[PDB]
């Protein structure tokens, strides 16, 4: 069982236990639930001394704390506070096992703090162990997290290779549970040169996107933060159809943030378009109105309506038979 250090420390028997007085039982203090806590506290604020001497005990042992449920904190502790010596030794005891380490479930968290505090050569060396295991790591549970994060702290042009990977997959990606997430990291992140193939791609899906569980997101993304080239090209897509995806589960999202983000002018032609809209025995606005996912449309298309349309909107609205 645990040592007896361990044991009364995790009873309370030391209100003050210090860093130096758990020399020789740190790897076992790093991977147990309490005893990681505390290093992982007492580092934030030890002198580099006091740093150093917890650094020579686990740097034999580095890479399984890396895989450990407690011990990655220690680990990425270092990555945050630690020396740059440290940080170092760190990196090489992680060369040649960078995708290991991203597939793995706490080893993905190391590579994540280390990505967020080395230095970009380091980093290069890192991310380009990926190479030919991109999509993989994309998809995967684990892996999805150190992808996203390379986007997020590496220099684009390092990135390249990622990109190049999703030539012809952006549809796949987007409509993936962890590769959408991925796909709007590159969106906010990269250089035009690069989100440019990627726009494409989801410009030539977007009808189907739409529609789609987590693809709607990634349009919602371009939406909410993309340029208006490329919102003009989406409400194109929404344009004609504002009735029948207003009525869908995801399709209706897009349509709202449509109404929400368009141009002056782009609002009006959906608004009207809505109006002067037919849904067999009645007219589009009736229908809408009263769907479970076509009415937040409805609403939203309201206050954002310029007070001209807002009235004609409301006055085939009068009738309140529902």
Same mark, same amino acid.
């Given at each position: 069982?645990?040592?007896?250090?361990?044991?009364?420390?995790?009873?309370?028997?030391?209100?003050?236990?210090?860093?130096?007085?758990?020399?020789?039982? $740190?790897?076992?203090?790093?991977? +147990?639930?309490?005893?990681?806590?505390?290093?992982?506290?007492?580092? #934030? !604020?030890?002198?580099? &001394?006091?740093?150093?001497?917890?650094?020579?005990? $686990?740097?034999?042992?580095?890479?399984?704390?890396?895989?450990?449920?407690?011990?990655?904190?220690? $680990?990425?502790?270092?990555?945050?506070?630690?020396?740059?010596?440290? /940080?170092?030794?760190?990196?090489?005891?992680?060369?040649?096992?960078?995708?290991?380490? &991203?597939?793995?479930?706490?080893?993905?968290?190391?590579?994540?703090?280390?990505?967020?505090?080395?230095?970009?050569?380091?980093?290069?060396?890192?991310?380009?162990?990926? +190479?030919?295991?991109?999509?993989?790591?994309?998809?995967?549970?684990?892996?999805?997290?150190?992808?996203?994060?390379? @986007?997020?702290?590496?220099?684009?042009?390092?990135?390249?290779?990622? @990109?190049?990977?999703?030539?012809?997959?952006?549809?796949?990606?987007?409509?993936?549970?962890?590769?959408?997430?991925?796909?709007?990291?590159?969106?906010?992140?990269?250089?035009?040169?690069?989100?440019?193939?990627?726009?494409?791609?989801?410009?030539?899906?977007?009808?189907?996107?739409?529609?789609?569980?987590?693809?709607?997101?990634?349009?919602?993304?371009?939406?909410?933060?993309?340029?208006?080239?490329?919102?003009? /090209?989406?409400?194109?897509? @929404?344009?004609?159809?504002?009735?029948?995806?207003?009525?869908?589960?995801?399709?209706?999202?897009?349509?709202?943030?449509?109404?929400?983000?368009?141009?002056?002018? #782009? !609002? &009006?032609?959906?608004?009207?378009?809505?109006?002067?809209?037919?849904?067999?025995?009645?007219?589009?606005?009736?229908?809408?109105?009263? +769907?479970?996912?076509?009415?937040?449309?409805?609403? /939203?298309?309201?206050?954002? &309506?310029?007070?001209?349309? !807002?009235? $004609?909107?409301?006055?085939?609205?009068?009738?309140? @038979?529902?």
């Amino acid at each position: 069982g645990r040592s007896r250090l361990l044991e009364d420390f995790r009873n309370n028997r030391y209100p003050n236990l210090q860093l130096r007085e758990i020399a020789g039982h $740190i790897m076992e203090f790093s991977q +147990d639930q309490h005893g990681s806590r505390f290093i992982q506290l007492k580092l #934030e !604020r030890a002198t580099p &001394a006091e740093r150093q001497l917890v650094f020579n005990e $686990i740097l034999q042992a580095a890479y399984q704390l890396m895989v450990d449920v407690f011990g990655n904190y220690v $680990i990425q502790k270092f990555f945050e506070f630690g020396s740059l010596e440290q /940080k170092l030794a760190l990196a090489e005891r992680i060369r040649g096992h960078v995708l290991s380490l &991203a597939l793995q479930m706490y080893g993905c968290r190391v590579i994540q703090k280390a990505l967020e505090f080395i230095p970009s050569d380091q980093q290069n060396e890192m991310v380009r162990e990926l +190479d030919g295991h991109v999509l993989k790591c994309v998809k995967d549970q684990n892996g999805n997290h150190v992808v996203q994060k390379c @986007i997020e702290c590496v220099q684009p042009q390092s990135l390249q290779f990622i @990109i190049d990977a999703f030539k012809g997959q952006v549809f796949a990606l987007s409509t993936h549970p962890y590769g959408c997430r991925v796909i709007q990291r590159i969106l906010e992140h990269c250089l035009p040169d690069q989100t440019l193939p990627i726009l494409e791609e989801l410009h030539q899906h977007t009808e189907q996107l739409v529609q789609d569980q987590y693809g709607n997101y990634v349009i919602q993304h371009v939406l909410e933060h993309g340029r208006p080239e490329d919102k003009s /090209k989406i409400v194109a897509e @929404i344009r004609g159809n504002v009735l029948v995806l207003s009525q869908h589960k995801f399709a209706s999202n897009v349509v709202e943030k449509c109404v929400t983000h368009a141009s002056r002018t #782009e !609002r &009006a032609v959906l608004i009207d378009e809505v109006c002067t809209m037919n849904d067999g025995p009645h007219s589009a606005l009736y229908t809408m109105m009263k +769907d479970q996912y076509a009415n937040y449309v409805v609403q /939203k298309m309201i206050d954002v &309506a310029e007070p001209g349309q !807002r009235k $004609i909107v409301m006055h085939k609205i009068r009738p309140h @038979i529902a």
